[PDB]
Design a protein around this ligand. Sequence first.
Ligand SMILES: CCCCCCCCCO[C@@H]1O[C@H](CO)[C@@H](O)[C@H](O)[C@H]1O
Lengths: 234, 231, 241, 234, 230
Amino acid sequence: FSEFKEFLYEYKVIPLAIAFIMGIASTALIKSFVDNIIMPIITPFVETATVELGPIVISWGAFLGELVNFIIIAFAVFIIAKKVLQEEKVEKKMTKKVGIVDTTFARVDMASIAIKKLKELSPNIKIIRKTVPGIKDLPVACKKLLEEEGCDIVMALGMPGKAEKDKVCAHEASLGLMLAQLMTNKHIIEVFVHEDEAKDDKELDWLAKRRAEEHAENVYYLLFKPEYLTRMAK
Amino acid sequence: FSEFKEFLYEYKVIPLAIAFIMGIASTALIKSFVDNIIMPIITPFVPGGGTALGPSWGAFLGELVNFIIIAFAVFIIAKKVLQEEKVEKKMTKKVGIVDTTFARVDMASIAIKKLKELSPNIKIIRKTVPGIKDLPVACKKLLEEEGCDIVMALGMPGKAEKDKVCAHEASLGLMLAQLMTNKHIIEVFVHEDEAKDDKELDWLAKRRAEEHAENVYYLLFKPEYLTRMAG
Amino acid sequence: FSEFKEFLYEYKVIPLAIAFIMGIASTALIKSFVDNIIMPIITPFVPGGGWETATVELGPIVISWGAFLGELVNFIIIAFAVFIIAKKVLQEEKVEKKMTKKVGIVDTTFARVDMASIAIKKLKELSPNIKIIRKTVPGIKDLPVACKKLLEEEGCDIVMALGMPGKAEKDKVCAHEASLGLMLAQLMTNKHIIEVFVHEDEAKDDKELDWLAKRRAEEHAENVYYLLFKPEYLTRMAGKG
Amino acid sequence: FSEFKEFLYEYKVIPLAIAFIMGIASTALIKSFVDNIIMPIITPFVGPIVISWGAFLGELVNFIIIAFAVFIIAKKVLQEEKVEKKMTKKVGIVDTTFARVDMASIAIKKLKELSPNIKIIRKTVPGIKDLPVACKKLLEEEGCDIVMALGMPGKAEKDKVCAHEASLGLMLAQLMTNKHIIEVFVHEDEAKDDKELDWLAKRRAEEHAENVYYLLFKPEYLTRMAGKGLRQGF
Amino acid sequence: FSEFKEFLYEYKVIPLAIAFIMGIASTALIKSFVDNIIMPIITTVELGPELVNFIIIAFAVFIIAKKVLQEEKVEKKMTKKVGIVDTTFARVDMASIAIKKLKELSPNIKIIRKTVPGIKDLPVACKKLLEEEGCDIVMALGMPGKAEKDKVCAHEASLGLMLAQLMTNKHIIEVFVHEDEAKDDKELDWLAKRRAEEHAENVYYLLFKPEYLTRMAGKGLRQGFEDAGP
Ligand SMILES: CCCCCCCCCO[C@@H]1O[C@H](CO)[C@@H](O)[C@H](O)[C@H]1O
């Protein structure tokens, strides 16, 4: 019996049942709105037709009549459909939550340097953070967010390594990044910063955080002010 | 209570309630289209006339056949409708062009010029992004939400024996996006290791931008052209 | 009006409404086949035996099944009859439809010598019941989407990748890049896709290359055919042919 | 007749027959809950300038009210649905046979260690070029709310391809389902002798086993570790 | 008219229609088994101060589902089809060496071959088998080409092979056997099949025998030239 609770969950039998009951309840519902409003009032009172075919066309005539009846039934339905549409196009637009994703592996915490330049430009940016150990483990992560919490765009916060060989990891992670993106439309902002881009510790420090902002920057534009970059089109 | 408004939204209880009820209206409708038309009169056709002791399968057989015709006729009608729709793909919808904030020479225009010319009937849309490495989730957005049945990929690569990865990196996301949804996004790359000075680069850049757009027209309306070109 | 009509489009509600109605037609349809043909014929208990009066007697009271069995077994008989017809129909469906049309051969705008024809020739020869669709493209880095559609939005149970890569130790990348698409292509859908690459480094002059290009397309087509029909040929061919 | 068994299998007519019947049982269930609980108390005892009018409208509101009941019931069923015992859960580790050091246990130790209620699950395979379908399955057909990439690399300038290859798929596998597949690679070109490799190995084995624990329950930790240090390894 | 027979197929309208009707049949049946059959013989706390009744009946149905699941589980188990795919570009038939060793480790492994001509192709095929026949695994016994340029192919194919697996929960045993691992013909030949069998070997295991591999652990097992210890 203690294995039984597994089928309900993996299969989630409850979710389907409910969703339809609102199907039946949610549709039987929208119906009387047209059945008991929309129609009797917006249709009462309102062809002169004799012709050249028959009577097997009287079949055609009967057909025409039926069509008209349906139309009375059906165009009302169409109208109701239209009415529903207007609400759905109503909602909220571009004043959303941007989440930023980070590395324990990397050296120079850049979660802030950006979180700042961004909250600044716009206070109403409910931010969300999540961290992973490996440069190569942000992906699942960033998506999860893009998939389960608006996170309507994100930043790739972290640093790569040294030596000729570790060049692979960047390529590799990035492929999966682009992918995460494509698996769901929403640019995940790659915030990469290779270490071989300095000559000491201090030099690199500046380089990261400075960068870490310029992007939290473009985040704004690709969020609320498109034209700008449009203009920044060298 | 201010919590309930959340369930209704996440699950979208309305989107289903509508779509299903529409079905009944949308099915009941077309039904009489045959129940009361193509049947009551197209009937004097094919009694058919005259397979496998004590014996009503037949009279029923005829009825079954009629129903098949009505069903088969419905299928035919559906096919016709599809074709009609598909004529809509004889008629056009539009180009799409995506641009960088990383580029050094704005192709965008050089291109848009050679596109409205060869064909005025082309309602262009522009959308930009910062990094080479992004184009895709965008390239895909247009193509996923807005028509744009083709899209020029406007961008410029970098230098150094090390920034050749970007090209490889991005190109894949491209075909990916491509193969994500049947749309030929022409990669409009222009590496910076293809010159000696500034002016030289410039000419090379915009010049190409056209050659592709050039083709963009072709892939659109004039396949044969490319056809003969082969090879 | 117009706006609404646009609204109607895009989502493809029509698809549902059609298929939806269709089920009703299709269902009510096959039913008639049983309600009046398969069943009003299949109903003597006989022949066949082995029903049960497994000492129905004083229990004091164990029964529930006998009646149920009778009624049930009676419904099973009807369901069972229906099932058989379905299988028969399926059998007919399989065995009948070798009627087949379409190969599909996509080409370059990049390449220097037209293969397509070289390949097309041998193809219809190997069998003239092949419906060929040629469709070209400009950059070698394109075919993918294309081949894809040919395999998705038309039958083309296969296709040829007649194409031509470039020179220089740098344009080697393209081949790689493209091949992948090709796979993604292939992998996106269960239709093999010969890759008709040839690189331009495989020679010392113009004429040499020319022979080489066409020579292959043919070879390929060759397999196309078996690959379409003659799996047995190749079956043996392992180990160098 | 020995051919019939095929149809029943290929189309799986049983699964539907069950799920379908289940729906009826599952729906009537949720119904009685409203029809007989949420309503028979939670809601009881609580001229026109006319035309078609005031009986029409009045019936419209009643018909609307019934929908509210249904909505309430739906809410109730959703609510009962718990966030209970999420996090706890099962780990599971995958291993190699193309490998040279059994890391498997190394981490296994550190793990049950920091937390005893972590039923672990093992399974293995031949080379590196495979693990994927494995991990996937696990992460897919059992909880394994994450898992590790326990496996060994290789040495010649050519076998480098292996990591690249497998991994691209790790990321896919991960992408393909929102779970962390912790990559536990240990390149053999990171040593000068046998014993040397050995340590670096099992040592690294614990270094992420550790991160599993955090990533499972301890999130804030990695948060804070943030930008600072921790290259899980040498 | 000669165009419609296409639609019925691409969509396979009938298979559904059938399955659909069967559902009603398949369901109504089991019903009588409970409505009519299991029930008529049969007949949490507090606050002083029908839903339970409904739940009782509902509960009863639930059990039936698990019984049915068990029943389904009884008819066939981890004892079937392999179905190897092989090369045509190949320099030596690998298929036989493992096909042999396979039937050995046990006869209950209906083998189902097939081949193709270019090394890159397989993927689709390999996929196809896994998907449209219960090849609950498969090999691929490839072979690559020479020169320091063709190496690309192996990568290319493999990643696809890789998705192949990824698209479907079934172990693809790539079997790549490069030709830069020899000095002459005969040498390579050996390396070749030899390796083939070894993989077959694991294949017996990966299917039924999982403990075997478990123990191997980090211990040696380096299929190839000369098994390299732990
Ligand atoms: C997309 C929204 C759907 C919500 C869930 C209800 C699914 C509607 C499917 O209809 C069913 O389709 C079958 C296929 O033809 C028919 O056999 C059957 O008669 C019909 O009932």
